[PDB]
């Protein structure tokens, strides 16, 4: 059996969904700047082991249509979780709870899914992005700008049109290659006018996990769609901060496994390692199982270390 692609009408969107296997549903949620395609290895492994793997393209990505690119306010965390809740109702009508696997912005969506609707998630495997406790004093954009300054990627992503104009002359393939092959623990810097010049390159041998065919799949989708839908998620971070005040003090009560690559830039945010390892993470997420750090791996662990990630998912969900 091959991977089946369908379109599902949900939360005002026409959402592209890729599917493989039969049995209990596992929803895979991708991050930035990625696609359903990022789960290619895991869908195969889990389907061959008696699970039904479902991976959509998210609001503003790939073959998912309907979101107003001109309005970043329609890319809030409330809209994104709304999309996922609607999807699950449409595609898993007979499972009250499903398994969720998520990465990066997908992981952020999944954290809030669990906060808003724990009645929908039986267990969670999150990659790269740890639970981010709301800072009472400032939003994420402001907090990271205080640490890393004006050229931080999240800061530079904020003004509509700006980063799109920077990527325009460079091309989708060169931007995507530069990001996917990134290994340095520093955040991305996009100083005005300087293209991809502020981004360090790793030795070529360390990206042998990414074929030219794989890179082309990503590049071809993003050349068509552009980067606006994807980047809009970061533009909604200031409103996300305001809109999430009701959940100050709320815990995630879903059984959870967290996995991160050693060199993931997110893992190197000041204070992140302390939060993760010394009790803060477990206090917000009481059913957090043992945290897994992948030695010698960077941000894109589902593609860089597919066997390790696939087996970690299988072993976790088999416990339920």
Explain what the structure shows:
Keywords: Hydrolase. Residues 24-129 form the AB hydrolase-1 domain. Pfam families: Abhydrolase_1 (PF00561). Belongs to the AB hydrolase superfamily. Epoxide hydrolase family. Strands 1-2-4-3-5-6-7-8 form an eight-stranded mixed β-sheet, sandwiched between helices. The protein is built from 14 helices and eight strands. It has a single domain, classed as Rossmann fold (3-Layer(aba) Sandwich). It is α/β, with parallel strands linked by helices and 320 residues long. The protein has helices at residues 40-47, 77-91, 105-116, 140-148, 153-156, 162-170, 172-180, 212-225, 228-235, 237-243, 272-278, 280-284, 301-304, 306-317; strands spanning 4-10, 13-20, 25-29, 52-56, 98-103, 121-127, 256-261, 292-294.
CATH topology: Rossmann fold
Number of domains: 1
Distance separating the two termini: 26 Å
Total beta-strand segments: 8
Broad CATH class: Alpha Beta
Main beta-sheet annotation: 8 strands, mixed
Estimated radius of gyration = 18 Å
Helix content: 25-40%
Largest beta sheet: what is the strand line-up? Answer: 1-2-4-3-5-6-7-8
* Percent in strands: 5-15%
**CATH architecture heading:** 3-Layer(aba) Sandwich
What structural class do the secondary elements suggest?
A: alpha/beta
The helix/strand series, from N terminus to C terminus, equals EEEHEHEHEHHHHHHHEHHEHH
Q: Per the principal axes of the C-alpha atoms, what is the gross shape?
A: globular
At the fourth CATH level, what is the homologous superfamily? Alpha/Beta hydrolase fold, catalytic domain
Tally of helical segments: 14
Keywords: Hydrolase
EC number: 3.3.2.10
Organism: Solanum tuberosum (Potato)
Pathway: Secondary metabolite biosynthesis; terpenoid biosynthesis
């Amino acid at each position: 059996k091959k991977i089946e692609h369908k379109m599902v009408a949900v939360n005002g969107l026409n959402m592209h969904l890729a599917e493989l296997g039969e049995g209990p549903t596992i929803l895979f949620i991708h991050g930035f700047p990625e696609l359903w395609y990022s789960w290619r290895h895991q869908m195969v492994y889990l389907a061959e082991r008696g699970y039904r793997a479902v991976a959509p393209d998210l609001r503003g990505y790939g073959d998912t249509t309907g979101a107003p690119l001109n309005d970043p306010s329609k890319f809030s965390i409330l809209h994104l979780v709304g999309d996922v809740v609607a999807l699950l109702e449409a595609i898993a009508p007979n499972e009250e709870k499903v398994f969720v696997v998520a990465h990066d912005w997908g992981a952020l969506i999944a954290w809030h899914l669990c906060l808003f609707r724990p009645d929908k998630v039986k267990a969670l495997v999150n990659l790269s992005v740890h639970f981010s406790k709301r800072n009472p004093k400032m939003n994420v954009v402001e907090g990271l700008k205080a640490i890393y300054g004006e050229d931080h990627y999240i800061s530079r992503f904020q003004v509509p049109g700006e980063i799109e104009a920077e990527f325009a002359p460079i091309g989708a393939k060169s931007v995507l290659k530069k990001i996917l092959t990134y290994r340095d623990p520093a955040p991305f810097y996009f100083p005005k006018g300087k293209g991809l010049e502020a981004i360090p390159d790793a030795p070529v041998a360390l990206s042998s996990w990414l074929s030219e065919e794989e890179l082309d799949y990503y590049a071809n989708k993003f050349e068509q769609t552009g980067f606006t839908g994807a980047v809009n998620y970061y533009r909604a971070l200031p409103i996300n901060w305001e809109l999430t005040a009701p959940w100050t003090g709320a815990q995630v009560k879903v059984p959870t496994k967290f996995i991160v690559g050693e060199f993931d830039l997110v893992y190197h945010i000041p204070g992140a390692k302390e939060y993760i390892h010394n009790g803060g993470f477990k206090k917000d997420v009481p059913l957090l199982e043992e945290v897994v750090v992948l030695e010698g791996a960077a941000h894109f662990v589902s593609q860089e270390r597919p066997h390790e990630i696939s087996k970690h998912i299988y072993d976790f969900i088999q416990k339920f």
